[PDB]
Amino acid sequence: GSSGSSGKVVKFSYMWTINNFSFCREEMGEVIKSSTFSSGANDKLKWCLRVNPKGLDEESKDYLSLYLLLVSCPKSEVRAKFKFSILNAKGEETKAMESQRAYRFVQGKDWGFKKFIRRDFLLDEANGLLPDDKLTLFCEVSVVQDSVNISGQSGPSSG
Template identity: 30%
Template sequence: MSISASSVGSSGAPPQPSSRSSIIAAAATGKHQLKIDSYSLTTAVPRGTHIKSSNFQAAGHSWYINYFPNGCGRLLKRARGYVSLQLVLDGAAADGAVKAQFTLSLLNQTGQPAPETVRKSPVHKLAGGWWFYRFIKKEELERPFRGLLRDDGFTLQCEVVVLDRFRAVKTAPFVEVPPPDLQRHLGELLLSGEASDVTLQAGGVRFDAHRCVLAARSPVFKAELLGSMKEGTSNCDIHIEDMEPRVFKAVLQFMYTDALPEVDKKEEAAMSQHLLEAADRFNLQRLKLLCEDKLCGCIDTGSVVTTLVLAEQHSCQGLKEKCFEFLKSTGLNAVMATDGFNHLATSCPTVLEELMSKLTLH
């Protein structure tokens, strides 16, 4: 609901507002994704028993989720064969309650909420927790064609909307200012090749680009290109050694648009590794951190050791610590037989010593 007001003139002409304002309900929103690993093991807990998530912040408040793999205890018969969930407000609000609405869903293989799993609560005042007694049938969750379980795990998305106050806002209905579109224009410039003054070759593929953009984005290209810019404006060729064309194309796209192309989920880890190496090579710090963050979410038994070597070689401390954390939880037995472990022992012995020290303390 909103209340609007307008200021009007006093002439006989049809009144036209000279300004407008509104009173609207202010809503704080937040999303949190909870990954449930080893689902088959969680189903071994007794009915009515829950597993508590870590606390998370959403919409200005602290929450946690109680996960009941075999149904909650309150309605044990009605919840039999279902997964039950309880969203809990951790700590009391200033007035003892929070007016909120919640939406819970399971993510499908594309990372989007599966429509058949979306559960939304009514808007209500919450002082404790909100139950989803019959969130989803276990047999539906476990059906392969649903695509909800992946590697014996699933991801739950929780969206919280808190209605906390009313506020007055000014609106500007007469002039609509569009969002910035510099990235789109630069992307089109790269795609068209218009006014290009440098050609880069990677793996036999030529890419037309613009010295000023490359120099502005990368200190490495700046050092290489500014000298030749002073000497003239003729086009020059630069050979990019030891880099696949698709990787360099993605690097160029990032330099022009600050965004990366969509990559198939199966190729995400490998592409992120290549791009991290390229980012370090061209001193693209934001791209490097983006890739480091993506790789933190791609670690598994088969890749953890090679990822650890990569992190050490390119000074990615956060990624390195994530690898250590993974190995602490799984132990070394699962990875010692891999080629990556032998590579770690020969190429990064100090990292292996650090790992062994951490595991011993653990």
């Protein structure tokens, strides 16, 4: 619905601080998957982030390769918007890449960018993105919803 009502959108952010980012002993192909984060409750729809310090390919080996992977999902496919950002030593957003478009996510789907930031830039002191060698990646996921509000308050039916 382009012209009319839009609805509600469930979004949630998750701060992932990778201690010793410069110590990542991963090849130029391996990826680092972080735990599963959700809006709050033990929702069935989970999400994960795949970051690559040593890059993924020879084209973006110098820069970092981050991608949003859908660890697990309740329904077949799910649409949501992702946003990657870096929190400097002052916990301030810098060198973040956001897009005003939602992609199709499915159990085992990876979507993101090849060249997110120059690895040499992070380790750089001028920026101070890593005051203690900790890579804090602030991601934000927004699941498209349709004014849907699921409530419980059901009977105990205990005994």
